[PDB]
Each structure stands twice: as C-alpha cells, then as structure tokens.
Amino acid sequence: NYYATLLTLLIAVIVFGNVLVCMAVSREKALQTTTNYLIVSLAVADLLVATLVMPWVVYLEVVGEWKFSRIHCDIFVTLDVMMCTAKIWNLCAISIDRYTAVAMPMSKRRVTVMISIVWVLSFTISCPLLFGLNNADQNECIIANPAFVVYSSIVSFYVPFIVTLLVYIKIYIVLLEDNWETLNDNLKVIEKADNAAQVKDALTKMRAAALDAGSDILVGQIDDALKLANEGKVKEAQAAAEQLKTTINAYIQKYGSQQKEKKATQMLAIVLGVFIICWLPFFITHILNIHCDCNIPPVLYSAFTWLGYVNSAVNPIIYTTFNIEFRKAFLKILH
Amino acid sequence: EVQLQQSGAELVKPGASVKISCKASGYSFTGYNMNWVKQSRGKSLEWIGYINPFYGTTNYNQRFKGKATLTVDKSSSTAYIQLNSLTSEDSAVYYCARRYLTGTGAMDYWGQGTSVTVSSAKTTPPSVYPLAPGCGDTTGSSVTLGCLVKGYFPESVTVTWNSGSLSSSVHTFPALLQSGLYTMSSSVTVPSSTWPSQTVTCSVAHPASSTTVDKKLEPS
Amino acid sequence: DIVMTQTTSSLSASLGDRVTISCRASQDISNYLNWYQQKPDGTVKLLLYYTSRLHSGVPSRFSGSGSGTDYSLTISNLEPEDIATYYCQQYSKLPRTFGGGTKLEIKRADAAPTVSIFPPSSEQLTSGGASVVCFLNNFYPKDINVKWKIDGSERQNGVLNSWTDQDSKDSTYSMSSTLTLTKDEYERHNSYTCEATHKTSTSPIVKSFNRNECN
Ligand SMILES: O=C(CCCN1CCC2(CC1)C(=O)NCN2c1ccccc1)c1ccc(F)cc1
C-alpha cells in the first residue's frame, strides 16, 4: 500500500530507460557494435525483469501472501532467477568482449554465439524450478529450498562474478611519440644505409627507444637484426628492418585501438561496480542466514531485494553520463 | 529420529503474555515450516498459523493476528509462540507441528502439547470431605465410600485410597470449575464385612499448595 | 473459512468391526482433506493425506474416500489401539480448518448403574456449605439422566455432573452428581433424592435420605 505505488514508479522508470537504450542502439549506426549488442541484450534482460517478474514481487510486498497457484509461483520464480542469471552472465560476456577488443583488436558469429550461450546457460540453471522442485508452502512464494539457494548462489553469482573480476583484472593489467619518431628515422637510416656500422648504430638507437614502448617482440626482433650487423650482413639486416617497420606500425595501430576502447571499458567497469554494489547485501545476508543461523528479519531481505532491483534502472543513466553517442541518440530520439 | 518437545504447562494471570517453546530434533530445522495449532477445552482444533524457519516469514490465520507471534531460533533450532493479552478464551492446549513436505497442507509430526490456563485465582489448598454411607442407608454386600475434594487451585490433585493399596474398585472423577475453583471426587468400593473393621483412608495431594490431607472414613 | 462438520461426536463400535467416520465440508474442497488421530494421552498422529494416501507407518486397516463435500475414513477391523479421536482437516483454502472430532468407544453389553448417595459431612456444614453427592458407577451406555429432588420438587441450579472416560477394565462409564447448597437452605428441607433414568431399566433408580433421621 505504501511501497506499492513507489515501486510501481520504479518499474515504469526501468521499462522506459531500457526501451530507450534499445531504440537508441537500434536506429543509430554509430552505436552498432558488438559490445553494444551485448549491452542491448542486457537491457532486454532488465526489461524482462521489470515487466514479467517485478509486478508479482510488488504484489507480495503489498499483500504478504501469495494467493495464486503453486505453478504460477514456480514459473515466475523461474523467470526471476533466469533473468538475473542472464544479467550477470551478460556482464561476464561484456567483460570478455572488452578483453578481446583491447588485447586482440584484430565477426558477428562470436557475438551471436555468446548471446545464445548466455541465455541457454541461464535457462539451464533455472530449469529445475518449473519442474516442481520448488516446494513452496501454501500462500507463500519463495525459493523454498536452501540447497537450491546454495547452488544458485554458486553457479549464478559467485562463478560469473569471480570470472568477470579476473577478466577485468587482466584488462587493468593492460596499461611515446618521440619514440616512434626515433624508430622511423632510424628505419629510414637503415633503408638508405650501405654499410654495417650505420645499421648497427641505428638498431642500437632503435632498441634504446623501443624499451619505453614494450614490456617484448619488437625488442627481440631488434636483437636478431643486431646480431646480423656484427657479422656484416647488411641486406639481411635491411630485410629484418623492413619487417621491424611492420611490427612498429602494428604497435601504433594496437595502442590506438586501445585508446579508443578504454572509455567504453571504463563505463562498463563502473556499470559492473554498481551492479555488484546493488546485489552484494542480498547474498551477504543469504550467507549469513545459511552459515550463521542468524535470525534475519524479512525487512532486510525485502530491502536488499529492492536494493538489487534498483540496479535495473541505473544502467541507462551510466550510458547517458559516460558515453557521447549514447547521449546524442537519446536527445535525438526524444525529439 | 524426529522429536518435537514443547515447554511445560503455563498458569498465567489474565491480561499478561506467555511464550511457549517447541524444540525439534532429527532433521534439518530450517527446511520444514513449523505450524502452531490450538485445541480448546471443547476438543476442537484451530490452525493458529505457520512460520518458515529459513526466511522467518509467517502466515497467520486472520483470527489469531495480533494474538499470536511466531518466532524461531535457528541456533537452538526451536520455534516459539507468544500469546499476548490473555483472556479466558485463550486457555487451551497448544501444539507445534511439522509441515509434511509430501502432503500439501498436512502436518506429519506433532508435539506433546502445552496447556495454558488463564485465571486470576490464587493457589488454594483443597478441602477434603468424607463421604460415608447415609443416615439410615441400607447397605448390600458392597459399600461405596467416597472423598469430595472441594475448592482448590490449580489443577493436578492426586487422590489415592489406603496409600495406593486400594486400586481395583476406585473411580476418580475429573474436576470441574465451581465458584472459580476446582472440585472433584473419588469413590472406592469394598465388601461390607470389611468396613469399618478394616480402615479405609483417602489421601489427597496438592503439590501446588505443598499440602496433603488424609481423611479416614468412619460410619454415620 | 470452510467449516468442517463431523456428523457424530461419539461413536460406539464392537472390536474387530468396520468403522466409518463421515466428514462434511461446507463447500467443495475438491478432495483436499487429511485425517489425524489423537490418543487419550493427547498425542496426535497423521494418518491420511489427499483423502486416500496412507502416511508412513500406519496400518492398512485405514482407508479414506470421498468427493465434493462428503468424505469418510474407514477402519476395516477395529483393534484396541484404534480407540481414539479422529479429526478431519481441509486444506483447500486458507485458513486450514478442522472437524469437530469423532471419538471412538468400545461397544459392550448394557449395564445398570450402581447408585449411592451421601449426605453432607459435618466438616462441610461447619463451613456453611452442604454437598449431597450421588455416585452412578459402572453403567453402559453413557446415556444417563440424573434429576435432583428436594422435598419432591426438582432442582436444576447448583448441580455439577462429572463423567469418567470409558473404563480400561470393564469398558463401563461412571459419573458423579453433586448438589451444592448453602447450610441455610439445606437445613430448611428434609428429603434429598437422586433419581437416575437409564436404558437398562424402565423405572427410575431412586436413592434418597431424610435429613431428620441422621446422626
Ligand atoms: O536470483 C537472483 C535474484 C532473486 C531475488 N528474487 C528471489 C525471489 C523473490 C524476489 C527476489 C524473493 O526473494 N522473495 C519473493 N520472490 C519472488 C519471486 C518471483 C515472484 C514473486 C516473488 C539473482 C540475483 C542476482 C544475481 F547475480 C544472480 C541471481
């Protein structure tokens, strides 16, 4: 009666924001990329949460007694668990796509595969509930099995969260103009060179300048080219220098793609952070209830349920604040 | 092996509150919802409600809302019912029971029950009156002697004849309320030739008032 | 609030007989009904669920049936352990409700009551009270009627009546009837009479005493 209208407003906000995200990516071609495709899948998941599941949760928050059939409750609890598992696995897939884009910038079949895998795995995880394994008592609607609570926390939350944290750690691991100028100048010096001393000196300066860029394949190739010059093999050193130019251009392209993608990476990182912040107290109280025998009041359960549901509305705000083309598409579709 | 042991009987003044416990043993406590059921003096049963021990959630009979409060202690694996604002209508037996998972809406294992008596009566020892054959009452081969136990509180008076030696021909009648106190009676039967030649004595024992009265039946 | 009705509160059956206990729901509970047993020691046992399904550890003498609003429990042969009170409960909708209960008694041969009457003790008269007591012992069936007469006129108020449960030994019943008067009213009348009608006799069984022939 009190929270009834308030969470109705939250449901409407979630629906509007996610429909907005979906349309903005659907019509504007600046946003039509694979990672944004995964983002739209996540938005569809949140929309399904707000539309199909949240009304019945509001009904239970209002009347306090599930006054419908056991199959009704089983089906909609199945939908709840499946959509939330889909959300977290979509976040994991987005982390994986960001790692792929940053590490290996070198195509839609993979996107279709990941989207289908996310939904297939979520439906597989949530299957047991529709088969009557949820034995809820009369006029109550919960996950009535603690063992299934543990299994769902393990496969639906802990594994995807840990894998996503590790992938984003790998991404954070991945973190010079005068150096490129020096490299190219010494490359052309080797190209116009006619003896071995000039090539040796130029490759020495190239190795000195290439330490700042690498960690390194470029340095090893420079060392191989450098062995050639002590033996006086000028033509072989020049061929190695031509392949070195290829490697240097590849480095330039890679660190340009990386600088382009870092901003979207940061936006998705803060999205993941907000998701974890919203959904952490729920599982914290669950683990307390299980491994403590803590007499936890249901008010905390409902409060943390809704704290985790709030995350279904903050993703469009993050897309608006931390992205340019998304905000442009928003303002344009509004008029 | 499953067992639900409930607390002892309660003798509460009206208006006060009481808290009955129900300790479970032999299964995972947090899985089986705990029901509480009332049985009035009239032997009729009422589903007070139930509580889910895992989530602490409760579902009440709308008739008992605000009268009963269901709680759990997962550490001690114990359910509790608390009755507030006690009136005469609240004195009854209260059972806890375990939700039968296989059978929807059924309770498979019950407790031994907990009596609750709401009364503003003070502990009162009993008045033991002897019942001997009447004034000009002609007797047959057998003679029935009696003892009337009047005006005591609370319940559980124990009546024996000749310290327990006479057991065969004894009838003990259940007590009833009268002027706010309990009354009961006992009868024994012996051959006429044996009384009063062989003593017959009734022993009434009221633990609550720490009292025992022995009355030896005599003619006339 | 589905009111459950059990047709007979008491029901007598010979040992090794077929017993049937009916239970009428106030509406169509669609075969959502369970049967519990409560022994004299108050212990409650789950016998049947879903109107026909035996719980674990109950013998095959028991069987349930029914549809719509009418349901029934059936004991093929009655054993002495089955003497108890049987309750039917509907779970078709909350709240869960129970039936009034049907208690079993052993059927046995008719038996006339032994009637004894006792005047008030002197010890009670010194308290200003006066209880006349009537014992009706070892009779069957439990259907008995007791009237109190003072100087020929019937008295209703001031009469307490206590029945015993069916006897473990002879399966009979007994009762006590107590007429409680003040000493003042007691000493203003002469004849005190305890009259008992029972199926075993066409004439009432009368036991009386006159207060002025006492010592
Ligand atoms: O499964 C979940 C979330 C489950 C939270 N939902 C669990 C079930 C719920 C709502 C909240 C509850 O608690 N009471 C009532 N009820 C309910 C269910 C269906 C219909 C009506 C009421 C998840 C979340 C994050 C994640 F990363 C992985 C999984």
Author numbering:
A (entry chain A): 35 to 140, 148 to 216, 1003 to 1042, 1066 to 1106, 364 to 442
B (entry chain C): 1 to 220
C (entry chain B): 1 to 215
Publication excerpt:
In humans, five dopamine receptors (D1R–D5R) have been identified and have been classified according to their sequence, intracellular signaling, pharmacology, and localization as D1-class receptors (D1R and D5R) or D2-class receptors (D2R, D3R, and D4R).
The D2Rspi structure demonstrated the inactive conformation because the seven helical bundle structure and the conformations of the four activation microswitches are more similar to those of the inactive state conformation in D2Rris than those of the active state conformation in D2Rbro. Spiperone was bound to the orthosteric binding site. On the intracellular side of the salt bridge, spiperone’s fluorophenyl ring penetrated deeply into the ligand-binding pocket, binding in the bottom hydrophobic cleft. Thus, the direct interactions of spiperone with Ile1223.40 (3.7 Å distance) and Phe3826.44 (3.6 Å distance) in the PIF motif may block the conformational rearrangements of the PIF motif and help to stabilize the inactive conformation, as has been observed in the structural studies of 5-HT2AR26 and 5-HT2CR27. In D2Rspi, the ligand-binding pocket was covered by the C-terminal segment of ECL2, on which the side chains Ile18345.51 and Ile18445.52 pointed to the entrance and the bottom of the ligand-binding pocket, respectively.
